[PDB]
């Protein structure tokens, strides 16, 4: 029907722009820049210009926070379209803002909030919308009170706009329109939907669970490093679905003597219960309810007790979800991870580059920037860096901008037009980098990595056996099935030294757009050294929950080398650390798509226990890189780099024969420092380019890594693996 | 505007004098060792002689403690230059110590306390000016009574200081001179200008975070091996600020 759609989010930050399909459209005979009025709950309607995109399906209607608001809907839900009947220009039309968004902040309100905002925009204009408008690193709301030209109206250039004062109180029925929602949210795209799937069905349709009888999810805990945003993500979810959203903080229950905190808890889940469908989040959870064990009092245990107990009850439909989120997720009472308390387990995580820019582009939001301010170049340097870590460093250049014009116009309930009148200068963001302080920098990174087949060359048979384990199993699991056959889920990639394993890994991860994860040999040795393999255990964990997955262990020798050689110091090949990873291979499904690589030099000395089938039972030789190789690392290195255009990369790969990719590495690494060496000193005797010279000058110190001797051994090891028999001649009878 | 400057710490421990730039000196015409009527807030004013100095910037101002608690107000705030109109010389000028600040030590206060202070050294003396001398293992302030010749004046060798007695009781809203301070801190310039950073904006502007929004840091956490100073760097930081410093 075209007079029913279903809401989504606003991809854009328009204010009064609604995005639509042209299918939708077609039914409708609308142009792409008219009007219509939309028509909401409780009487509400609003009128907004529509908007073409096919990111929506055919029937979806895409509003943002604010106008969405106006119909006094949410996410999902029906909505007419209704268009307008071409309602003529507005004559007066009076605003004014509303008295809690407002507070603080005085003046005039014209050349700073109204006027940019109407300025070269007709936006269509109701007696009773709300509109929200981001300045002076402010959100500021204002409501119509009057419109002389009926109650609709569209805002033109010549029409005087006047706003006389007296703020209008905040409605009874209408919440704040800048407090937390999705759009707060950066790039949490995985578990914010899956968040919202478990959140949908059992509080947007309370009394389907009163008449079908399905289990929804009761508890749902949000786990992962501190300052990833888990409250904001609660908060969110509450607030977009309208369910009432009851916190519990862990220090404020355990503040409060050995009584009122169990009344607390309980009351928490009372007041739940009284008030239709709610979700309960548990901020640090671990402060709660940590390890029965480790307690040491009876209040603590009769604490962790209640809240069982509590959350036993809450197995009723009484619409109820438990959010909880921890930085423990091994140091919470397990009996609280059992099924039908927290069964649903979601990993925040820590932001990838995409998410430190949609994190960086939502803070920055409401502040003036300035021309210069990338905001991406910050968002590449921010590595290790959690949402929390990122609104540091924004708070902190907002604040030595505001370090430099500090005294100079007083700030004295101060005026708008100065608060309007700031601006964040790139080199700021660059100063807060150095003292940025991240906390999440020792954290596993776990990303899809940037990596593709093109910054590796050659390899052509490598990258085909590559993706015939990874990419079919992956993209193709029709087949797999159709022939009844498990894809192998690892492989050991060996080799000499520098010749592309971490990036035909990463290549392979890309390729499938899939999670990859480096254990490199310092971790491999820490285990071993500390004799802490269980950690071993984890790490095929955070393989498992990112699945799919690449699992990579770069020197996964380093504790055959670090015992001797291959027999090592009087046993055998078996160590501690490589036997938990040999149990946690076998362990895996297949079914997750989790691949574990392991990459080694010293294929003589790995224990063979984990060359056997089921295990890393393919074994690829990684050889010294051909010429097309080097030309795609010199490229590959050499790119972010001004280099002249007559050095003959091609050539220069025609005499580095025996060389490995960490060759020509060093290659560049010295020629591109002679380079800035050379532009150092003339700029000192003065006060472009990686130029040829500056090439024969690095290739004048060109020394190969891996000698004849060691390519021999490993040409002889590849011989013996893969030289087979003499079976080329079998052939069926007739 | 020759009116506006911004208060800075004083490099030298000197009494009486103020350290300014040449080209703030070009817009006022002034001499190197004239004397100036700086007028603070809360209708305070004080009279003080100049000093060029190229270490603060071109409108920065350098004021020592003492004489920055004489015009009522604080680091980075806004003082004007008013030049004085050549006040003569004073002819008794009586001044006496603050109760507090002499408590246990008594007798003679001219030789030990006063002549070295006025001794080859003319410093502009207000009805209103209190000034600390350093001596005897101790800081003790003195607070002028009167001045005959006119409110303002400048100590002159042959002029007769009377110290009758009496010492005046501590004033309601004005703190003790030496109890802690920027200048009491030892080489932390690092980690105090750190410091200074993260609280002048909570605390010397708070409306501004009542109408901005942006969040400032809450918590800071000093840590070092005992005896660093951590909270002698505490309490001079509020003091400078003159936020209210609470103890736990
Ligand atoms: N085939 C290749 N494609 C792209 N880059 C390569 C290739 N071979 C080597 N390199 C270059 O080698 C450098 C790093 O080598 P890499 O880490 O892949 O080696 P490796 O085979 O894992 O060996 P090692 O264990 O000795 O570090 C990078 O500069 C990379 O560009
Ligand atoms: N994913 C995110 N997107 C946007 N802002 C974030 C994100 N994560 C953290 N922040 C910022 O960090 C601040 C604190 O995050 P917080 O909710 O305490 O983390 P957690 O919920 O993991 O304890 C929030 O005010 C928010 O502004
Ligand atoms: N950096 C410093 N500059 C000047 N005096 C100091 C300094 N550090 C310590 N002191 C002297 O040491 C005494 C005790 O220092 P204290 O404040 O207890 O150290 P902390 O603050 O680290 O506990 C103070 O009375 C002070 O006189
Ligand atoms: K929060
Ligand atoms: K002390
Ligand atoms: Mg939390
Ligand atoms: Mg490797």
Redesign the interface.
């Known amino acids: 029907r075209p007079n029913r759609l279903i809401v989504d989010e606003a991809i854009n930050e328009d204010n009064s722009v609604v995005s639509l399909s042209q299918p939708k459209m077609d039914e409708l005979q609308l142009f792409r820049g008219d009007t219509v009025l939309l028509k909401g709950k409780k009487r509400r309607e609003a009128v907004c210009i529509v908007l073409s995109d096919d990111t929506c399906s055919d029937e979806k209607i895409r509003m943002n926070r604010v106008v969405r608001n106006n119909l006094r809907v949410r996410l999902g839900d029906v909505i007419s379209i209704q268009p307008c009947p071409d309602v003529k220009y507005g004559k007066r039309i009076h605003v004014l803002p509303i008295d809690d968004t407002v507070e603080?902040?005085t003046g005039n309100l014209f050349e700073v909030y109204l006027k940019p905002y109407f300025l070269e925009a007709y936006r269509p204009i109701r007696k009773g919308d709300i509109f929200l408008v981001r300045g002076?690193?402010?959100a500021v709301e204002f409501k119509v009170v009057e419109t002389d030209p009926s109650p609709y109206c569209i805002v033109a250039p010549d029409t005087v706009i006047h706003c006389e004062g007296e703020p209008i109180k905040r409605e009874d029925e209408e919440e704040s329109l800048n407090e937390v929602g999705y759009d707060d949210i950066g790039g949490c795209r995985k578990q914010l939907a899956q968040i919202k799937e478990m959140v949908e069905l059992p509080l947007r349709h309370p009394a389907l669970f009163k008449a079908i009888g399905v289990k929804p999810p009761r508890g749902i805990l949000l786990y992962g490093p501190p300052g990833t945003g888990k409250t904001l993500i609660a908060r969110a979810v509450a607030n977009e679905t309208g369910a009432f959203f009851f916190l519990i903080n862990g220090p404020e229950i355990m503040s409060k003597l050995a009584g009122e905190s169990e009344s607390n808890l309980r009351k928490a889940f009372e007041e739940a219960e009284k008030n239709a469908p709610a979700i309960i989040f548990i901020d640090e959870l671990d402060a709660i309810a940590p390890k029965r064990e480790k307690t040491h009092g009876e209040v603590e245990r009769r604490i962790v007790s209640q809240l069982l107990t509590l959350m036993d009850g809450l197995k009723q439909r009484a619409h109820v979800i438990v959010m909880a989120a921890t930085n423990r997720p091994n140091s919470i009472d397990p009996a609280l991870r059992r099924f039908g308390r927290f069964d649903r387990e979601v990993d925040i995580g820590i932001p990838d580059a995409t998410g430190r820019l949609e994190i960086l582009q939502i803070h920055t939001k409401?502040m003036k920037l300035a021309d210069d301010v990338d905001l991406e170049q910050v968002a590449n340097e921010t590595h290790g860096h959690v949402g929390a870590d990122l609104?540091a460093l924004c708070?902190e250049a907002?604040?030595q901008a505001?370090?430099k014009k500090?005294?100079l116009i007083?700030?004295?309930?101060?005026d708008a037009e100065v608060?309007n009148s700031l601006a964040v200068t790139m080199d700021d963001f660059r100063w807060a980098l150095s003292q940025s302080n991240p906390s999440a920098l020792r954290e596993t990174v776990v990303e899809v990595p940037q990596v593709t087949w093109e910054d590796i060359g050659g390899l052509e048979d490598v990258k085909r056996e590559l993706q015939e384990l990874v990419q079919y199993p992956v993209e193709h699991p029709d087949k797999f099935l159709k022939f009844g056959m498990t894809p192998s889920k690892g492989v050991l990639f060996y080799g000499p030294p520098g010749c592309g394993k971490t990036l035909l890994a990463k290549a392979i991860a890309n390729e499938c757009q899939a999670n990859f994860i480096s254990i490199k040999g310092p971790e491999l040795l820490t285990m071993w050294f500390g004799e802490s393999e269980a950690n071993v255990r984890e790490i095929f964990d955070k393989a498992r929950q990112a699945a799919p997955c690449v699992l990579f262990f770069d020197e996964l020798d380093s504790i055959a080398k670090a015992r001797g050689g291959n027999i090592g110091d009087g046993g055998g090949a078996a160590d501690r650390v490589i036997n938990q990873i040999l149990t946690e291979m076998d362990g895996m499904s297949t079914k997750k798509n989790v691949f574990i690589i392991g990459a080694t030099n010293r294929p003589d000395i790995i224990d063979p226990a984990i060359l056997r089938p089921g295990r890393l039972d393919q074994l690829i030789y990684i050889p010294l890189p051909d010429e097309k190789s080097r030309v795609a690392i010199l490229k590959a290195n050499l790119r972010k780099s001004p280099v002249a255009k007559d050095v003959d990369l091609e050539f220069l790969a025609k005499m580095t024969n025996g060389f490995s990719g960490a060759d020509l590495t060093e290659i560049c690494q010295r020629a591109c420092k002679l380079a800035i060496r050379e532009s150092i000193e003339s700029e000192i005797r003065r006060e472009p380019e990686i130029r040829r010279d500056h090439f024969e000058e690095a290739m004048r110190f060109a020394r190969r890594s891996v000698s004849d001797n060691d390519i021999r051994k490993y040409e002889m090891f590849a011989q013996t693996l893969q030289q087979s028999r003499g079976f080329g001649s079998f052939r069926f009878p007739s």
């Open positions: 603080g902040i002076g690193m402010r409401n609104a708070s907002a604040l505001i370090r500090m005294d007083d700030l004295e309930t101060i608060m």
